Design a binder for this molecule. Structure first.
Ligand code: SAL
Ligand code: SAL
Ligand code: SAL
Ligand code: SAL
Length: 150
């Protein structure tokens, strides 16, 4: 439900990494479900974890989602006691956001499970550390272009 909720050489090349996304999320889905959190929620949670104290404004910008989407997901994170909002009289979109203790516990647990699952996947392949850094090198080049464009 989580993965479901979330929804030429150059051609074979792009296909090789774009088609891995969905299978990847299906496999990591249970990690989030076990913590009663959905993928959209996890991404914003993680984002806050790494940038807190942060704001709906900054979040929307780094995540590249629309305010309505970010507002709705944050609202669920708050309602679930995973993040706390600075109490202020300013606009909600300007208020500082940080993880609650429950939020941190959930975060550390998901993060470690994901890390171990990734290690496992790799361990079943013939991929070398070198092959991994070379891939990283190529992907970041692609990523630079897609972002500078936007
Ligand atoms: O950046 C993503 O789109 C993403 C999606 C699901 C899980 C981890 C991720 O980084
Ligand atoms: O970083 C990921 O690839 C990831 C995947 C599934 C759930 C949480 C995550 O951070
Ligand atoms: O990637 C995100 O930060 C995200 C968050 C909520 C809903 C959809 C999304 O892609
Ligand atoms: O509902 C809130 O308290 C809230 C707080 C910060 C950002 C968006 C929000 O909906």
């Amino acid at each position: 439900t989580a993965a479901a909720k979330f929804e030429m050489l150059s051609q074979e090349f792009f296909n090789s990494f774009i088609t891995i996304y969905r299978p990847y999320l299906k496999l990591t889905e249970p990690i989030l479900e076990k913590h009663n959190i959905y993928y959209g929620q996890w991404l914003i949670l993680r984002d806050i974890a790494k940038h807190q104290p942060t704001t709906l404004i900054e979040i929307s910008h780094r995540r590249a989602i629309e305010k309505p989407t970010a507002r709705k997901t944050l609202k669920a994170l708050i309602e679930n006691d995973l993040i706390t909002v600075e109490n202020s009289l300013e606009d909600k979109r300007q208020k500082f956001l940080t993880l609650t203790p429950k939020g941190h516990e959930l975060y550390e647990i998901v993060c470690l499970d994901v890390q171990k699952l990734q290690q496992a996947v790799v361990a079943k392949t013939n991929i070398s550390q070198d092959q991994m850094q070379e891939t990283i090198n190529v992907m970041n080049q692609i990523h630079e272009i897609l972002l500078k464009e936007a």
